[PDB]
């Protein structure tokens, strides 16, 4: 219905869901620490598109 | 009620997989305490 | 190696091994003697690593 399409529509055009790369995980990390030798970082699980 | 004016087409994505918490995928160990270093780099706790 | 298991390995080695590049290692090590020529031709020693 006009008013219904109205709704559900925007719900689609606002799917607050961004992608995700190993890189982003790495990044949700303080610019520091990574640059603090004392601590070890590494990847193990893969990432599906 | 007029049909054609009510019928719409749908742009929907297909098969995600939502992840929460996150982090976890972070494999991380740690040096042995006796080997600490500050921004300094010479070593923290160096009085043997 | 001493400065490795200390430094927490900077995936430096991890990369070189992965990418297959001519390199060496140093320090205390466990040798292992084998005979039956065979082993050699099969180029067994490329394993372990």
Secondary structure string (H, E, C) spanning A20-43 = CCHHHHHHCCCCCCCCCCCECCEC
The tally of CA atoms less than 13 A away on the side-chain side of residue B2 is 3
C21-47 in b/e form (b: 16+ CB < 10 A) is eeeeeeeeeeeeeeeeeeeeeeeeeee
What DSSP letter does each residue of C20-39 carry, written as one string?
T------SS-------SGGG
Nearest to A14 by CA among B11, B24, B30: B11
Residue A40 to residue B31, Cβ atoms within 8 A: yes
C18 interfacial to chain A (CB closer than 8 Å):
no
DSSP letter, residue C15: H
Alpha helices in chain B (DSSP H): none
C-alpha–C-alpha distance, residues C9 and C1, integer Å: 9
C17 contact partners, CB below 8 Å, separation of at least 6: C49
Helix, strand, coil percent content, chain B, rounded in steps of 5:
5, 10, 85
Give me the total of CB pairs closer than 8 Å, taking one residue from chain B and one from chain C. 7
Give the distance, in angstroms, between the CA of residue C44 and the centroid of all CA atoms in the same chain. 12
C8 interfacial to chain A (CB closer than 8 Å):
yes
A33 interfacial to chain B (CB closer than 8 Å):
no
Residue A37 to residue C7, Cβ atoms within 8 A: yes
Resolution attained, angstroms:
5.0
C-alpha–C-alpha distance, residues C42 and A29, integer Å: 45
Q: Are residues A38 and B34 in contact, defined by beta-carbon separation less than 8 angstroms?
A: no
Method: X-ray
CA angle B19, C10, A21 (to 5 degrees): 25
C-alpha–C-alpha distance, residues A41 and A28, integer Å: 13
A38 contact partners, CB below 8 Å, separation of at least 6: B30, B31, B35, B36, B37
């Amino acid at each position: 219905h006009p008013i219904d399409y109205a709704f559900n529509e925007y719900f689609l055009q606002h799917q607050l869901v961004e992608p995700l790369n190993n890189d982003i995980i790495f990044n949700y990390i303080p610019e520091r620490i990574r640059n603090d030798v004392n601590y070890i970082l590494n990847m193990d699980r893969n990432l599906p598109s | 009620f007029d049909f054609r004016n009510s019928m719409h087409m749908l742009t929907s994505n297909l098969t995600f997989t939502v992840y929460s918490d996150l982090l976890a995928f972070v494999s991380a160990d740690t040096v042995e305490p006796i080997n600490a270093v500050a921004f300094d780099n010479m070593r923290i706790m160096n009085e043997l | 190696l001493e400065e490795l298991m200390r430094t927490g390995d900077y995936a430096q080695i991890t990369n070189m091994l992965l990418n297959n590049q001519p390199v060496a290692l140093v320090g205390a090590l466990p040798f292992v003697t084998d005979s039956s020529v065979i082993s050699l031709i099969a180029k067994l020693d490329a394993t372990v690593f």
